[PDB]
Amino acid sequence: RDVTAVADVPRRMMEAWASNDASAFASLFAPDGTMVLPGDVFQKGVDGIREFMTKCYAGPYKGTSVFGVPIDVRFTGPDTAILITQGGVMAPGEHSVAPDKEIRATWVLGKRDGAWLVEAYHNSPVRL
Amino acid sequence: DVTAVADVPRRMMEAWASNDASAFASLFAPDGTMVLPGDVFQKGVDGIREFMTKCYAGPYKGTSVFGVPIDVRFTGPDTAILITQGGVMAPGEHSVAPDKEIRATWVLGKRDGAWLVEAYHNSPVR
């Protein structure tokens, strides 16, 4: 069963995010991985993400943690799977994502050398 | 394949300009995914067609979409990923408004020689 290896990827992030570890966060991505977030956010490559998330974790994302569940998991090929999760960012102090900051995310996972990595990430708000 | 992949966003822009919900949905894989800002998450061609029908007859009526591929990438032989920037242009206007500009992640899978959209997801720039 590799269906559990796929679902561990969003879990691997929550721990990396909870530690506010930019390196552990960016190391989830494929070497030429993509990440697009609401706002003027677009980072390509592991180095481009580690730099952005370091400045983020030291700023507006400090003391924040994330949580979300997969609401759709499908495999396209043998080495590529696509996830759609739903959760968001918790502020420091609160133990629940505010509905104004709830998001849905598209995870494009790729398999190489027996492991899965994020080929592309992208999320958007659920509320307006 | 290089041109075909780059032709997928262009095959939409014509389908959108015609307000054709069918031609838009036929771009997607059978189990294709589309996620948009707001509570919008459609799965499957039938789900997307029904959604876009209400949109093209609704708020998206008479609108067209421009978009520039700012990153094209091949993950494998049968899969490719595109990141595009642009947005929906209102009738009468000849430029996408700053507060309507978006970036989209396109996920293309190659089946039987043709490329179909496995996943689409966009988000506001402002």
PDB file of C-alpha atoms in Angstrom:
ATOM      1  CA  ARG A   1       0.000   0.000   0.000  1.00  0.00           C
ATOM      2  CA  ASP A   2       1.466   3.305  -1.174  1.00  0.00           C
ATOM      3  CA  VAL A   3      -1.822   5.096  -0.528  1.00  0.00           C
ATOM      4  CA  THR A   4      -0.615   5.694   3.029  1.00  0.00           C
ATOM      5  CA  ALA A   5       2.779   6.977   1.867  1.00  0.00           C
ATOM      6  CA  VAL A   6       0.929   9.584  -0.180  1.00  0.00           C
ATOM      7  CA  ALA A   7      -1.265  10.721   2.718  1.00  0.00           C
ATOM      8  CA  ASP A   8       1.789  11.029   4.969  1.00  0.00           C
ATOM      9  CA  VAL A   9       3.079  13.909   2.838  1.00  0.00           C
ATOM     10  CA  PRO A  10       0.555  16.422   4.201  1.00  0.00           C
ATOM     11  CA  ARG A  11       1.336  15.027   7.664  1.00  0.00           C
ATOM     12  CA  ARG A  12       5.078  15.425   7.124  1.00  0.00           C
ATOM     13  CA  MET A  13       4.415  19.131   6.541  1.00  0.00           C
ATOM     14  CA  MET A  14       2.346  19.783   9.662  1.00  0.00           C
ATOM     15  CA  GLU A  15       5.275  18.632  11.767  1.00  0.00           C
ATOM     16  CA  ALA A  16       7.744  20.608   9.649  1.00  0.00           C
ATOM     17  CA  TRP A  17       5.452  23.635   9.920  1.00  0.00           C
ATOM     18  CA  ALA A  18       4.882  23.237  13.670  1.00  0.00           C
ATOM     19  CA  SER A  19       8.645  23.379  14.175  1.00  0.00           C
ATOM     20  CA  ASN A  20       8.634  26.476  11.955  1.00  0.00           C
ATOM     21  CA  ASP A  21      11.391  24.696  10.038  1.00  0.00           C
ATOM     22  CA  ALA A  22      11.819  26.194   6.568  1.00  0.00           C
ATOM     23  CA  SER A  23      14.410  23.593   5.558  1.00  0.00           C
ATOM     24  CA  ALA A  24      12.198  20.657   6.530  1.00  0.00           C
ATOM     25  CA  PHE A  25       9.305  22.324   4.707  1.00  0.00           C
ATOM     26  CA  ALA A  26      11.170  22.942   1.452  1.00  0.00           C
ATOM     27  CA  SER A  27      12.756  19.481   1.550  1.00  0.00           C
ATOM     28  CA  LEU A  28       9.301  18.045   0.849  1.00  0.00           C
ATOM     29  CA  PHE A  29       9.446  19.479  -2.664  1.00  0.00           C
ATOM     30  CA  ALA A  30      10.904  18.023  -5.853  1.00  0.00           C
ATOM     31  CA  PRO A  31      14.152  19.744  -6.988  1.00  0.00           C
ATOM     32  CA  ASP A  32      12.205  21.876  -9.482  1.00  0.00           C
ATOM     33  CA  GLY A  33       9.036  21.930  -7.377  1.00  0.00           C
ATOM     34  CA  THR A  34       6.376  24.636  -7.515  1.00  0.00           C
ATOM     35  CA  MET A  35       4.451  26.556  -4.851  1.00  0.00           C
ATOM     36  CA  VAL A  36       1.729  29.141  -5.480  1.00  0.00           C
ATOM     37  CA  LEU A  37      -0.100  30.900  -2.640  1.00  0.00           C
ATOM     38  CA  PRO A  38      -2.748  33.657  -2.466  1.00  0.00           C
ATOM     39  CA  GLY A  39      -1.091  37.040  -2.854  1.00  0.00           C
ATOM     40  CA  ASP A  40       2.019  37.684  -4.925  1.00  0.00           C
ATOM     41  CA  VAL A  41       3.517  34.305  -4.042  1.00  0.00           C
ATOM     42  CA  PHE A  42       5.255  32.006  -6.522  1.00  0.00           C
ATOM     43  CA  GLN A  43       8.360  29.976  -5.697  1.00  0.00           C
ATOM     44  CA  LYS A  44      10.163  27.412  -7.842  1.00  0.00           C
ATOM     45  CA  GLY A  45      12.904  25.022  -6.750  1.00  0.00           C
ATOM     46  CA  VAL A  46      13.778  23.919  -3.220  1.00  0.00           C
ATOM     47  CA  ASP A  47      16.156  26.842  -2.646  1.00  0.00           C
ATOM     48  CA  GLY A  48      13.541  29.391  -3.700  1.00  0.00           C
ATOM     49  CA  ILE A  49      11.087  27.956  -1.179  1.00  0.00           C
ATOM     50  CA  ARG A  50      13.491  27.603   1.753  1.00  0.00           C
ATOM     51  CA  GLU A  51      14.396  31.275   1.364  1.00  0.00           C
ATOM     52  CA  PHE A  52      10.763  32.390   1.192  1.00  0.00           C
ATOM     53  CA  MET A  53       9.602  30.210   4.090  1.00  0.00           C
ATOM     54  CA  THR A  54      12.503  31.247   6.331  1.00  0.00           C
ATOM     55  CA  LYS A  55      11.446  34.873   5.967  1.00  0.00           C
ATOM     56  CA  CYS A  56       7.834  33.758   6.411  1.00  0.00           C
ATOM     57  CA  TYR A  57       8.396  31.687   9.549  1.00  0.00           C
ATOM     58  CA  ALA A  58      10.411  34.571  10.996  1.00  0.00           C
ATOM     59  CA  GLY A  59       7.560  36.947  10.194  1.00  0.00           C
ATOM     60  CA  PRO A  60       3.772  36.514   9.807  1.00  0.00           C
ATOM     61  CA  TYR A  61       3.905  32.711  10.134  1.00  0.00           C
ATOM     62  CA  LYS A  62       5.797  32.649  13.442  1.00  0.00           C
ATOM     63  CA  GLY A  63       4.163  30.392  16.025  1.00  0.00           C
ATOM     64  CA  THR A  64       1.634  29.140  13.499  1.00  0.00           C
ATOM     65  CA  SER A  65       0.712  25.529  12.772  1.00  0.00           C
ATOM     66  CA  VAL A  66      -1.400  23.909  10.062  1.00  0.00           C
ATOM     67  CA  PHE A  67      -3.905  21.065   9.843  1.00  0.00           C
ATOM     68  CA  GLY A  68      -5.983  19.685   6.989  1.00  0.00           C
ATOM     69  CA  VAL A  69      -7.597  16.491   5.744  1.00  0.00           C
ATOM     70  CA  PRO A  70      -7.459  15.006   2.243  1.00  0.00           C
ATOM     71  CA  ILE A  71     -10.878  15.285   0.605  1.00  0.00           C
ATOM     72  CA  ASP A  72      -9.655  13.721  -2.641  1.00  0.00           C
ATOM     73  CA  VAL A  73      -6.806  11.294  -3.343  1.00  0.00           C
ATOM     74  CA  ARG A  74      -6.205   9.804  -6.789  1.00  0.00           C
ATOM     75  CA  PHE A  75      -3.281   8.295  -8.687  1.00  0.00           C
ATOM     76  CA  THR A  76      -2.829   9.310 -12.324  1.00  0.00           C
ATOM     77  CA  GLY A  77       0.190   7.209 -13.246  1.00  0.00           C
ATOM     78  CA  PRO A  78       2.349   4.813 -11.225  1.00  0.00           C
ATOM     79  CA  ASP A  79       4.669   7.615 -10.087  1.00  0.00           C
ATOM     80  CA  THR A  80       2.264  10.565  -9.860  1.00  0.00           C
ATOM     81  CA  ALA A  81      -0.641  11.167  -7.479  1.00  0.00           C
ATOM     82  CA  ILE A  82      -2.840  14.229  -6.939  1.00  0.00           C
ATOM     83  CA  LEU A  83      -4.254  15.396  -3.606  1.00  0.00           C
ATOM     84  CA  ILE A  84      -6.880  17.923  -2.635  1.00  0.00           C
ATOM     85  CA  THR A  85      -6.737  18.828   1.046  1.00  0.00           C
ATOM     86  CA  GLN A  86      -8.712  21.253   3.196  1.00  0.00           C
ATOM     87  CA  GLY A  87      -7.547  23.068   6.309  1.00  0.00           C
ATOM     88  CA  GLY A  88      -5.568  26.225   6.962  1.00  0.00           C
ATOM     89  CA  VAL A  89      -3.202  28.144   9.217  1.00  0.00           C
ATOM     90  CA  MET A  90      -3.771  28.406  12.967  1.00  0.00           C
ATOM     91  CA  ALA A  91      -2.665  31.597  14.707  1.00  0.00           C
ATOM     92  CA  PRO A  92      -0.429  31.312  17.789  1.00  0.00           C
ATOM     93  CA  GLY A  93      -2.759  30.771  20.740  1.00  0.00           C
ATOM     94  CA  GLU A  94      -5.846  29.523  18.912  1.00  0.00           C
ATOM     95  CA  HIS A  95      -6.347  25.777  18.488  1.00  0.00           C
ATOM     96  CA  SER A  96      -8.621  26.015  15.454  1.00  0.00           C
ATOM     97  CA  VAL A  97      -8.439  27.495  11.957  1.00  0.00           C
ATOM     98  CA  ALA A  98     -10.638  30.573  11.607  1.00  0.00           C
ATOM     99  CA  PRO A  99     -13.142  30.171   8.725  1.00  0.00           C
ATOM    100  CA  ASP A 100     -11.751  33.402   7.243  1.00  0.00           C
ATOM    101  CA  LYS A 101      -8.378  31.682   6.825  1.00  0.00           C
ATOM    102  CA  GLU A 102      -9.553  28.241   5.695  1.00  0.00           C
ATOM    103  CA  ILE A 103      -8.060  26.972   2.435  1.00  0.00           C
ATOM    104  CA  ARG A 104      -8.198  24.118  -0.058  1.00  0.00           C
ATOM    105  CA  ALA A 105      -4.946  22.874  -1.573  1.00  0.00           C
ATOM    106  CA  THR A 106      -3.901  20.947  -4.677  1.00  0.00           C
ATOM    107  CA  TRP A 107      -0.951  18.621  -4.092  1.00  0.00           C
ATOM    108  CA  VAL A 108       0.862  17.198  -7.096  1.00  0.00           C
ATOM    109  CA  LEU A 109       3.047  14.384  -5.784  1.00  0.00           C
ATOM    110  CA  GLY A 110       5.832  12.675  -7.709  1.00  0.00           C
ATOM    111  CA  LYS A 111       7.624   9.420  -6.964  1.00  0.00           C
ATOM    112  CA  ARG A 112      11.357   8.870  -7.406  1.00  0.00           C
ATOM    113  CA  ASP A 113      13.840   6.562  -5.658  1.00  0.00           C
ATOM    114  CA  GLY A 114      11.014   4.993  -3.655  1.00  0.00           C
ATOM    115  CA  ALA A 115       9.902   8.256  -2.056  1.00  0.00           C
ATOM    116  CA  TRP A 116       7.173  10.807  -2.780  1.00  0.00           C
ATOM    117  CA  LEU A 117       7.842  14.531  -3.145  1.00  0.00           C
ATOM    118  CA  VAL A 118       5.680  17.568  -3.888  1.00  0.00           C
ATOM    119  CA  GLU A 119       6.019  18.399  -7.588  1.00  0.00           C
ATOM    120  CA  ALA A 120       3.614  21.309  -7.156  1.00  0.00           C
ATOM    121  CA  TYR A 121       1.592  22.981  -4.408  1.00  0.00           C
ATOM    122  CA  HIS A 122      -1.239  25.494  -4.738  1.00  0.00           C
ATOM    123  CA  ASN A 123      -3.955  26.693  -2.365  1.00  0.00           C
ATOM    124  CA  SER A 124      -6.860  29.146  -2.325  1.00  0.00           C
ATOM    125  CA  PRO A 125      -9.374  30.553   0.199  1.00  0.00           C
ATOM    126  CA  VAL A 126     -12.723  28.846   0.796  1.00  0.00           C
ATOM    127  CA  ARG A 127     -14.367  32.048   2.019  1.00  0.00           C
ATOM    128  CA  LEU A 128     -14.503  35.543   0.526  1.00  0.00           C
TER     129      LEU A 128
ATOM    130  CA  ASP B   1       4.103  17.366 -26.917  1.00  0.00           C
ATOM    131  CA  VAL B   2       5.918  20.641 -26.232  1.00  0.00           C
ATOM    132  CA  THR B   3       3.406  22.561 -28.351  1.00  0.00           C
ATOM    133  CA  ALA B   4       0.431  20.390 -27.379  1.00  0.00           C
ATOM    134  CA  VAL B   5       1.011  21.074 -23.684  1.00  0.00           C
ATOM    135  CA  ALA B   6       1.300  24.800 -24.415  1.00  0.00           C
ATOM    136  CA  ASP B   7      -1.860  24.566 -26.525  1.00  0.00           C
ATOM    137  CA  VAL B   8      -4.060  23.370 -23.649  1.00  0.00           C
ATOM    138  CA  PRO B   9      -4.320  26.803 -22.006  1.00  0.00           C
ATOM    139  CA  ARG B  10      -5.023  28.226 -25.472  1.00  0.00           C
ATOM    140  CA  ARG B  11      -7.752  25.669 -26.187  1.00  0.00           C
ATOM    141  CA  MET B  12      -9.509  26.951 -23.075  1.00  0.00           C
ATOM    142  CA  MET B  13      -9.284  30.646 -23.937  1.00  0.00           C
ATOM    143  CA  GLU B  14     -11.277  29.948 -27.101  1.00  0.00           C
ATOM    144  CA  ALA B  15     -13.757  27.768 -25.214  1.00  0.00           C
ATOM    145  CA  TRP B  16     -14.168  30.476 -22.579  1.00  0.00           C
ATOM    146  CA  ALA B  17     -14.590  33.225 -25.180  1.00  0.00           C
ATOM    147  CA  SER B  18     -17.434  31.193 -26.684  1.00  0.00           C
ATOM    148  CA  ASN B  19     -18.851  30.720 -23.179  1.00  0.00           C
ATOM    149  CA  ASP B  20     -18.895  27.014 -24.049  1.00  0.00           C
ATOM    150  CA  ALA B  21     -19.219  25.007 -20.834  1.00  0.00           C
ATOM    151  CA  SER B  22     -18.852  21.746 -22.766  1.00  0.00           C
ATOM    152  CA  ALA B  23     -15.655  22.654 -24.627  1.00  0.00           C
ATOM    153  CA  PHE B  24     -14.197  23.829 -21.320  1.00  0.00           C
ATOM    154  CA  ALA B  25     -15.097  20.625 -19.477  1.00  0.00           C
ATOM    155  CA  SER B  26     -13.898  18.355 -22.291  1.00  0.00           C
ATOM    156  CA  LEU B  27     -10.379  19.651 -21.629  1.00  0.00           C
ATOM    157  CA  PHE B  28     -10.417  17.817 -18.311  1.00  0.00           C
ATOM    158  CA  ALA B  29      -9.544  14.224 -17.482  1.00  0.00           C
ATOM    159  CA  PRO B  30     -12.511  11.965 -16.543  1.00  0.00           C
ATOM    160  CA  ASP B  31     -11.631  12.268 -12.839  1.00  0.00           C
ATOM    161  CA  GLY B  32     -10.299  15.790 -13.326  1.00  0.00           C
ATOM    162  CA  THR B  33     -10.166  18.341 -10.525  1.00  0.00           C
ATOM    163  CA  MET B  34     -10.888  22.064 -10.483  1.00  0.00           C
ATOM    164  CA  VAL B  35     -10.456  24.226  -7.375  1.00  0.00           C
ATOM    165  CA  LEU B  36     -11.247  27.959  -7.377  1.00  0.00           C
ATOM    166  CA  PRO B  37     -11.245  30.756  -4.749  1.00  0.00           C
ATOM    167  CA  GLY B  38     -14.361  30.515  -2.610  1.00  0.00           C
ATOM    168  CA  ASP B  39     -16.230  27.304  -1.834  1.00  0.00           C
ATOM    169  CA  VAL B  40     -15.590  25.865  -5.295  1.00  0.00           C
ATOM    170  CA  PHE B  41     -14.330  22.308  -5.744  1.00  0.00           C
ATOM    171  CA  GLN B  42     -15.524  20.283  -8.719  1.00  0.00           C
ATOM    172  CA  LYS B  43     -14.470  16.746  -9.585  1.00  0.00           C
ATOM    173  CA  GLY B  44     -15.221  15.056 -12.886  1.00  0.00           C
ATOM    174  CA  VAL B  45     -16.113  16.406 -16.316  1.00  0.00           C
ATOM    175  CA  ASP B  46     -19.842  16.284 -15.544  1.00  0.00           C
ATOM    176  CA  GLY B  47     -19.356  18.287 -12.350  1.00  0.00           C
ATOM    177  CA  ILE B  48     -17.280  20.926 -14.126  1.00  0.00           C
ATOM    178  CA  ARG B  49     -19.663  21.260 -17.079  1.00  0.00           C
ATOM    179  CA  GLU B  50     -22.633  21.788 -14.762  1.00  0.00           C
ATOM    180  CA  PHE B  51     -20.634  24.351 -12.800  1.00  0.00           C
ATOM    181  CA  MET B  52     -19.376  26.275 -15.831  1.00  0.00           C
ATOM    182  CA  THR B  53     -22.850  26.259 -17.408  1.00  0.00           C
ATOM    183  CA  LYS B  54     -24.209  28.236 -14.461  1.00  0.00           C
ATOM    184  CA  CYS B  55     -21.170  30.534 -14.633  1.00  0.00           C
ATOM    185  CA  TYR B  56     -21.238  31.220 -18.374  1.00  0.00           C
ATOM    186  CA  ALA B  57     -24.959  31.902 -18.085  1.00  0.00           C
ATOM    187  CA  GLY B  58     -24.202  33.769 -14.870  1.00  0.00           C
ATOM    188  CA  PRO B  59     -21.393  36.102 -13.717  1.00  0.00           C
ATOM    189  CA  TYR B  60     -18.949  34.901 -16.396  1.00  0.00           C
ATOM    190  CA  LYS B  61     -21.315  35.744 -19.263  1.00  0.00           C
ATOM    191  CA  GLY B  62     -19.670  37.667 -22.097  1.00  0.00           C
ATOM    192  CA  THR B  63     -16.295  37.465 -20.365  1.00  0.00           C
ATOM    193  CA  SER B  64     -13.036  36.223 -21.866  1.00  0.00           C
ATOM    194  CA  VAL B  65      -9.763  35.063 -20.310  1.00  0.00           C
ATOM    195  CA  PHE B  66      -6.154  35.846 -21.144  1.00  0.00           C
ATOM    196  CA  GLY B  67      -3.248  33.987 -19.559  1.00  0.00           C
ATOM    197  CA  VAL B  68       0.514  33.738 -19.946  1.00  0.00           C
ATOM    198  CA  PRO B  69       2.386  30.485 -19.251  1.00  0.00           C
ATOM    199  CA  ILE B  70       5.099  31.714 -16.886  1.00  0.00           C
ATOM    200  CA  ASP B  71       6.414  28.198 -16.244  1.00  0.00           C
ATOM    201  CA  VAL B  72       6.173  24.956 -18.221  1.00  0.00           C
ATOM    202  CA  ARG B  73       7.568  21.778 -16.691  1.00  0.00           C
ATOM    203  CA  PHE B  74       7.656  18.059 -17.481  1.00  0.00           C
ATOM    204  CA  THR B  75       7.709  15.740 -14.465  1.00  0.00           C
ATOM    205  CA  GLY B  76       7.661  12.552 -16.518  1.00  0.00           C
ATOM    206  CA  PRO B  77       7.014  11.408 -20.092  1.00  0.00           C
ATOM    207  CA  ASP B  78       3.230  11.343 -19.609  1.00  0.00           C
ATOM    208  CA  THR B  79       2.790  14.178 -17.104  1.00  0.00           C
ATOM    209  CA  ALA B  80       3.397  17.931 -17.319  1.00  0.00           C
ATOM    210  CA  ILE B  81       2.765  20.976 -15.114  1.00  0.00           C
ATOM    211  CA  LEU B  82       1.995  24.571 -16.100  1.00  0.00           C
ATOM    212  CA  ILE B  83       1.873  27.760 -14.068  1.00  0.00           C
ATOM    213  CA  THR B  84      -0.038  30.533 -15.821  1.00  0.00           C
ATOM    214  CA  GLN B  85      -0.734  34.158 -14.956  1.00  0.00           C
ATOM    215  CA  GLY B  86      -3.669  36.237 -16.153  1.00  0.00           C
ATOM    216  CA  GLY B  87      -7.336  36.396 -15.224  1.00  0.00           C
ATOM    217  CA  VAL B  88     -10.929  36.995 -16.282  1.00  0.00           C
ATOM    218  CA  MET B  89     -11.583  40.102 -18.364  1.00  0.00           C
ATOM    219  CA  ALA B  90     -14.946  41.853 -18.047  1.00  0.00           C
ATOM    220  CA  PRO B  91     -17.020  42.867 -21.087  1.00  0.00           C
ATOM    221  CA  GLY B  92     -16.076  46.310 -22.393  1.00  0.00           C
ATOM    222  CA  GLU B  93     -12.685  46.134 -20.693  1.00  0.00           C
ATOM    223  CA  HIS B  94      -9.451  45.427 -22.572  1.00  0.00           C
ATOM    224  CA  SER B  95      -7.250  44.635 -19.570  1.00  0.00           C
ATOM    225  CA  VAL B  96      -7.578  42.313 -16.583  1.00  0.00           C
ATOM    226  CA  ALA B  97      -8.190  44.368 -13.434  1.00  0.00           C
ATOM    227  CA  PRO B  98      -5.475  44.261 -10.737  1.00  0.00           C
ATOM    228  CA  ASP B  99      -7.942  42.852  -8.190  1.00  0.00           C
ATOM    229  CA  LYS B 100      -8.970  40.066 -10.584  1.00  0.00           C
ATOM    230  CA  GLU B 101      -5.511  38.896 -11.636  1.00  0.00           C
ATOM    231  CA  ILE B 102      -4.741  35.278 -10.732  1.00  0.00           C
ATOM    232  CA  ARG B 103      -2.142  32.519 -11.034  1.00  0.00           C
ATOM    233  CA  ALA B 104      -3.147  28.986 -12.000  1.00  0.00           C
ATOM    234  CA  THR B 105      -1.552  25.561 -11.603  1.00  0.00           C
ATOM    235  CA  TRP B 106      -2.256  23.260 -14.541  1.00  0.00           C
ATOM    236  CA  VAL B 107      -1.665  19.515 -14.330  1.00  0.00           C
ATOM    237  CA  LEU B 108      -1.652  17.747 -17.689  1.00  0.00           C
ATOM    238  CA  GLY B 109      -1.685  13.993 -18.235  1.00  0.00           C
ATOM    239  CA  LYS B 110      -0.994  12.368 -21.596  1.00  0.00           C
ATOM    240  CA  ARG B 111      -3.423   9.606 -22.571  1.00  0.00           C
ATOM    241  CA  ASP B 112      -3.688   8.148 -26.087  1.00  0.00           C
ATOM    242  CA  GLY B 113      -1.522  10.919 -27.529  1.00  0.00           C
ATOM    243  CA  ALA B 114      -3.691  13.794 -26.304  1.00  0.00           C
ATOM    244  CA  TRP B 115      -3.174  15.966 -23.222  1.00  0.00           C
ATOM    245  CA  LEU B 116      -6.027  16.499 -20.759  1.00  0.00           C
ATOM    246  CA  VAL B 117      -6.220  18.633 -17.618  1.00  0.00           C
ATOM    247  CA  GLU B 118      -5.835  16.379 -14.578  1.00  0.00           C
ATOM    248  CA  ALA B 119      -5.985  19.277 -12.126  1.00  0.00           C
ATOM    249  CA  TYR B 120      -6.602  23.022 -12.170  1.00  0.00           C
ATOM    250  CA  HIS B 121      -6.223  25.407  -9.234  1.00  0.00           C
ATOM    251  CA  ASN B 122      -5.934  29.201  -9.211  1.00  0.00           C
ATOM    252  CA  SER B 123      -5.521  31.965  -6.625  1.00  0.00           C
ATOM    253  CA  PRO B 124      -5.678  35.795  -6.501  1.00  0.00           C
ATOM    254  CA  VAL B 125      -2.497  37.842  -6.886  1.00  0.00           C
ATOM    255  CA  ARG B 126      -3.906  40.762  -4.894  1.00  0.00           C
TER     256      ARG B 126
END
